[PDB]
């Protein structure tokens, strides 16, 4: 399996274009309200739509009759309708028995599905659904189906739909032209596939059929020609600002460089030269270079100029070396004066975001580019490309099975988790079921249960956390100290145990009206053991309110396991177990399961208060990789400082 | 004026049919026809 995941954000491909879709998206890409044009697109469609309902309603009802009259004309030698699911060029009627039942079932359903897609075409009001699904169909159907028989079948249906309807010339012509498009697209052979050639050796070459880029909403492409009237020239410049700055900033804040605008309006500098000068401008520098790391600003510079994310590990490595050498100008210069930029946009065309629909996509930087094309990209300040690309070659990282966000910070108190929304730093990794996470023991390294399972109930001797035990006799256990004995020495020890037992369940010491006084005195009397006392504090409504309720279910399970057992979960096997209990039984039973677990009983007895036994490598790094606490012999060469021989 | 109510008014219920065994289980459909 793969060791890294870039993310799997929802992809929404446009299967076919409708009139409302074509109208709305036209102004959406331009970042405008629907003007007198785009409103009139809808107005004429909504008026005709009532008639377009009557087209389909007749054709949906009489669908059985159209396909029956078609199949009878085409297929000879029996009845084709036994197993229902004008210009002849030179067709020969196909025998029913000779063609075979399996081929006949295909033939019949396609004839119905051709008419079905015609009815959808009128209702949509755009023959896009036809153009896509009919263009590259002649070639694939040629193998085991005659083309000559299909043309006359559609032409029969054209006449069949004409005679059955026949209302008005303003009504029937919609039926006629859509059928006329249908036969013309079917007569047309399969066009050449769109070949996305790799710009260098590092990036793979791709191919996309001439059907996928026929529906998936074409990105509006603006080119600065010197003769254009200044209204559409303004539309080009606004689009150029919408590409570089992700949004129209000249409308928002009136932030515009008129010095550069004037030169492009004339034709002194090209759009290639404009993008160059605009991306090295202090206006871009402040917004997409200054707030970001060198790696992330590089990743943003890719989508602004080239209109795509970095494709390969080698590409990020190359372009980071450029931005380290000469900075932002040198990076911009490398991006504009590339073989890719001049191939896609040339000199005149404004850069555009080439995503799922525009071109063929590679299976490498899918989710990394999906989040990048979003407007929420310049808030993810953690790089997504260089992180995933490096993690691809490496094995599985030190991470919780349900992501990096599921890992809490290894602190004394407070369940603090990285938020998915606030500062996107989600790092998915394909963890399987039987994947045990390597955990660092607080005590001796030999006392790890992975290598030494017998030494699970061994106390950390001044290496890890302090162990609290009810070793000493509880006050008022035996009737030796009769009535009096005001100075019973064994009283402060059990109270310190209670406080520590509170400190383990809830990281911090609680307030006055939060302490369970009933549970405390039962432990002090010797009615319940520590195991029962820890269980009661974790079964408290306060623990539910503070740690369980405000947090994500599996985050709350993970933190509870780090508090009750003092250990992060090894992997899926344990996490799925408690998550199954959380679904069926509830929170209280999850508490019960973690206490009544065998590993709890082995590590901590009936008198032992739980403690931090194991840390995550990331957690220990936070503790012992700071300026202090770090030893000299961790990751540094130690030279023996000896007095010189001349001294 | 109240013709504008499409998403604000009463939603039109859509018929979604139960998904049936397909021609992958034609072997088993043949078996179920002979199990009588």
């Amino acid at each position: 399996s793969v060791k890294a995941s870039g993310g799997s954000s929802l992809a929404r491909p446009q299967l076919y274009q409708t009139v409302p879709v074509s109208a709305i998206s036209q102004a959406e890409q331009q970042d405008r309200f629907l003007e007198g044009s785009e409103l009139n697109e809808l107005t004429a469609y909504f008026q005709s739509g009532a008639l377009r309902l009557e087209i389909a309603e007749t054709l949906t009802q009489n669908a059985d009759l159209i396909v029956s009259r078609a199949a009878n004309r085409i297929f000879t030698g029996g009845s084709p309708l036994s197993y229902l699911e004008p210009i002849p060029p030179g067709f020969r009627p196909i025998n029913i028995a000779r063609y075979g039942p399996s081929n006949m079932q295909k033939s019949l359903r396609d004839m119905s599905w051709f008419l079905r897609y015609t009815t959808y075409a009128i209702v949509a009001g755009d023959p896009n659904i036809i153009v896509v699904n009919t263009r590259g169909l002649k070639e694939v159907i040629e193998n085991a189906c005659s083309i000559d028989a299909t043309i006359v079948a559609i032409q029969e249906m054209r006449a069949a739909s004409a005679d059955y309807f026949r209302n008005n010339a303003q009504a029937k012509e919609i039926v006629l032209q859509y059928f006329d498009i249908l036969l013309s697209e079917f007569k047309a052979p399969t066009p050449a596939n769109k070949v996305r050639q790799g710009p260098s050796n590092d990036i793979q070459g791709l191919e996309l059929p001439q059907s996928y880029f026929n529906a998936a909403a074409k990105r509006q492409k603006y080119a600065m020609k010197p003769g254009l009237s200044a209204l559409e020239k303004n539309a080009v410049i606004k689009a150029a600002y919408r590409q570089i700055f992700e949004r129209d900033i000249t409308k928002a804040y009136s932030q515009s460089i008129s010095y550069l605008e004037s030169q492009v309006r004339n034709g002194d500098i090209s759009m290639k030269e404009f993008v160059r000068r605009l991306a090295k401008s202090p206006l871009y520098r402040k917004q997409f270079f200054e707030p970001f790391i060198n790696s992330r600003a590089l990743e943003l510079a890719f989508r602004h100029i080239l209109g795509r994310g970095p494709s390969s590990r080698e590409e990020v490595q190359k372009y980071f070396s450029i931005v380290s050498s000469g900075g932002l100008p040198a990076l911009v210069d490398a991006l504009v004066d590339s073989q890719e930029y001049a191939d896609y946009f040339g000199e005149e065309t404004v850069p555009y975001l080439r995503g799922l629909g525009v071109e063929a996509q590679e299976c490498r930087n899918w989710g990394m580019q999906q989040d990048l094309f979003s407007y929420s990209a310049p808030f993810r300040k953690v790089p997504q490309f260089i992180t995933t690309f490096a993690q691809y070659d490496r094995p599985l990282p030190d991470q919780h099975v349900y992501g990096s966000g599921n890992d809490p910070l290894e602190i004394q108190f407070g369940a603090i988790f990285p938020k998915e929304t606030r500062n996107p730093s989600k790092r998915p990794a394909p963890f399987n079921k039987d994947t045990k996470r390597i955990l660092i023991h607080r005590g001796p390294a030999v006392n790890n249960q992975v290598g030494n399972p017998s030494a699970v109930g061994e106390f950390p001797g001044s290496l890890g956390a302090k162990v609290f035990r009810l070793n000493g006799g509880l006050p008022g256990a035996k009737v030796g100290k009769n009535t009096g004995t005001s100075v019973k020495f064994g009283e402060s020890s059990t109270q310190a145990l209670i406080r520590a037992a509170y400190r383990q369940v809830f990281g911090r010491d609680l307030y006055e009206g939060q302490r369970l006084s009933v549970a405390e005195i039962q432990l002090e009397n010797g009615d319940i053991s520590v195991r029962e006392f820890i269980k009661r504090l974790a079964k408290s409504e306060l623990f539910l309110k503070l740690y369980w309720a405000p947090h994500y279910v599996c985050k709350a399970i993970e933190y509870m396991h780090r508090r009750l057992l003092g250990r992060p979960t090894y992997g899926r096997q344990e996490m799925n177990q408690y998550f199954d209990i959380a679904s069926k039984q509830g929170f209280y039973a999850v508490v019960e399961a973690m206490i009544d677990s065998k590993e709890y009983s082995d590590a901590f007895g009936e008198d032992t208060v739980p403690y931090e036994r194991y840390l995550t490598p990331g957690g220990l790094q936070m503790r012992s990789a700071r300026v202090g606490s770090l030893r000299e012999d961790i990751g540094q060469r130690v030279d023996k400082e000896v007095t010189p021989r001349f001294v | 004026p109240s013709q504008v109510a499409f998403a604000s008014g009463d939603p039109i219920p859509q018929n979604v049919a139960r998904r049936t065994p397909g021609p992958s289980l034609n072997r088993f459909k043949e078996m179920a026809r002979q199990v009588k």
Binding site: V2, Y212, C363 | -
Partner: protein
């Protein structure tokens, strides 16, 4: 991208070792099999379009729901995209055959395949089935053709099956 030569270099470079007897023998095994690997690559280059189409035709007869409604191979747009994908897997296995290493198969195919297929709604089960049908189509054609070694042909397609498919057990 890494071949069997580069993988062996990287393995010995990591440890900082000169190429020993075991290293030279593994290279010699590659160079002797290389002639059969190019000849196998010449076979699939000849029958690139024919295998892809026939393997798809077998797949849509095995799992008919793909080319039926609600299926992800229903429309012409989907049918062209699936045959393109089948063309991709054969093309990258073509690279993997000569390379004798599944690094090219990992880096440019498998790395972000699960993420993409889960996004659009592309099935991952019928996919690896379609890859395995292609494998059986190559192996049978390689058995028919005058080829001495045919065992290396199964390697890239099985790796394509292992990495992409869900862990059942």
């Amino acid at each position: 991208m890494r071949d069997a030569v580069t993988t062996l270099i990287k393995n010995y470079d990591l440890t900082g070792r000169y190429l020993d007897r075991n290293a030279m023998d593994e290279l010699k095994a590659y160079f002797e099999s290389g002639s059969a690997r190019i000849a196998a690559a010449a076979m699939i280059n000849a029958n690139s379009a024919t295998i892809v189409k026939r393997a798809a035709a077998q797949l849509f007869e095995e799992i008919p729901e793909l080319i039926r409604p609600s299926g992800n191979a229903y429309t012409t747009r989907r049918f062209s995209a699936c045959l393109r994908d089948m063309d991709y897997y054969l093309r990258y296995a073509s690279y993997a055959l000569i390379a004798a290493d599944n690094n090219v198969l990992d880096e440019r195919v498998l790395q972000g395949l699960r993420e993409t297929y889960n996004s659009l709604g592309v099935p991952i089960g019928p996919t690896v089935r379609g890859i395995q049908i292609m494998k059986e189509m190559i192996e049978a054609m390689a058995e028919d053709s005058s080829l001495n070694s045919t065992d290396f042909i199964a390697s890239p397609f099985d790796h394509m099956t292992r990495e992409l498919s869900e862990l059942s057990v």
